[PDB]
Amino acid sequence: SGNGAQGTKFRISLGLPVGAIMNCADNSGARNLYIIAVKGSGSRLNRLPAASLGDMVMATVKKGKPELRKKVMPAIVVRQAKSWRRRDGVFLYFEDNAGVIANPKGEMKGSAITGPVGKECADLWPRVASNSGVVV
C-alpha cells in the first residue's frame, strides 16, 4: 500500500513472494505481471518479500504489448490462490493470481477488470472497485 490507500488492511496470508508471475486482470494490453518487490515490506535476513490481496507491488511485464515491457511499474494484487482467513471465519481462495496496473497514486491504467475482485482490495483502493464488475 503506502500512499493512496484509504484506510488500513487486515493481515491476509502471504502467497506471492518475489519472482511470482500473476495474470493481468485489466485491458492494459499486458498478459502477465512479474512481481519484483512489495511495498511496505519488512526487513529480515534471507526472507523473501511476499505479497497478499490488496497489497501494492512493483512488477514488470513479460508478455504483452512491446511498449509496456522492459520497464518497472506499480501493480495492485486483486486475486489470490493461497487461502486466507477472514475475520468472519471463512477460508476462501480464488482460482488464480491476478493483478492490475496502477500508478503510484492508485489510478488504474485500464478501465475494466475481468473476473472477480476481492472485497479487501476493493475497500483499500476506491478506483479498483469502480472498474470492478463483480466483487467476490
Binding site: 468472519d88 471463512v90 477460508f91 476462501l92 481462495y93 480464488f94 482460482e95 467476490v136
Partner: protein, 63 residues
C-alpha cells in the same frame, strides 16, 4: 449467524467450518470439509457419489 449448505454434498455448514472456493467467472462454492472439496477438485459428479444429498433425491432414497 447464518447456516450455509454444501454445494457438492449438501450438508449444513456452520460458521468457521469448511472452506470457500470461487471459480474464475463468478461462481462461489461452499464445502463442509476437505472430503467435499477434494471430490469436487477431481471433477467427480455429485449424482454418482452415494452419500450425497443429490444422490438420495434422484434415487428416491429417504421419502
Amino acid at each position: 449467524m447464518k447456516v450455509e449448505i454444501d454445494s457438492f454434498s449438501g450438508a449444513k455448514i456452520y460458521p468457521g467450518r469448511g472452506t470457500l472456493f470461487v471459480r474464475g467467472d463468478s461462481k462461489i462454492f461452499r464445502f463442509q470439509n476437505s472430503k467435499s472439496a477434494s471430490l469436487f477438485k477431481q471433477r467427480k459428479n455429485p449424482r454418482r457419489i452415494a452419500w450425497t444429498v443429490l444422490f438420495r433425491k434422484h434415487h428416491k432414497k429417504g421419502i
